[PDB]
Symmetry: C2
Subunit: 131 residues, 2 copies
């Protein structure tokens, strides 16, 4: 059972896998950070925000970077938007209000039925263009 | 002493002043909403967000609208970014990532020294252009 369920041991397992330094890109590091971050573990959310922004353990994903930055803003009383603001500021050329809208609805959709409808509408239109 | 110190009575005084319906624009309604909102009273923050967005009790102010929307996201567990996202989405033509950056640093500057420096840098540059 090499499969932690507690967010602290998930986060630590992610570091352990990364330290194995196979290719230094560790997709399972991203996987375990996500499990940890989804249970609200702030260190995992911070690492995941950097991972998605920079493409550390996998592809870059600006919208998911913005999502985790938003999560950090909501859950770190000494952040309250600093990392998100600085990311937008230094990526003014790449970050669109559209990506930010999607990340925000993604966050809001957890406890707000109106947000879940708007989020799904964005996803469905983003998908029917690839279709 | 027509000057409440408790955020609930401030909020209620704001409604009372507004119901006087002098010009239906009530700058003192905005004033008391701000006192209430600054002590963390969510109903005041929501009304103030609408006030700044629409110019109800005074001039419009998109950056302050975004600020209070951010505050609502951080303090309303069933919002978590919905009102902010929807505001950006329906004002894509007016809202700039620059205004959002300023609102976010304004929020973050309360408990983050790095945010306060970045916020002041934005303010100082915004002021030296009018100078």
């Amino acid at each position: 059972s090499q499969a932690p369920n507690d967010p602290i041991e998930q986060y630590e397992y992610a570091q352990q896998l990364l330290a194995s330094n196979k290719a230094e890109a560790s997709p399972d590091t991203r996987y375990w950070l996500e499990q940890s971050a989804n249970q609200g573990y702030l260190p995992a959310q911070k690492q995941l925000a950097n991972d998605f922004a920079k493409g550390i353990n996998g592809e870059k994903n600006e919208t998911q970077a913005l999502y985790w930055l938003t999560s950090i803003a909501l859950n770190d009383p000494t952040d309250q938007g600093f990392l998100l603001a600085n990311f937008i500021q230094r990526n003014q050329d790449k970050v669109t209000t559209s990506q930010l809208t999607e990340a925000l609805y993604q966050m809001a959709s957890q406890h707000n039925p109106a947000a879940e409808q708007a989020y799904n509408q964005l996803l469905e239109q983003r998908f029917n263009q690839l279709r």
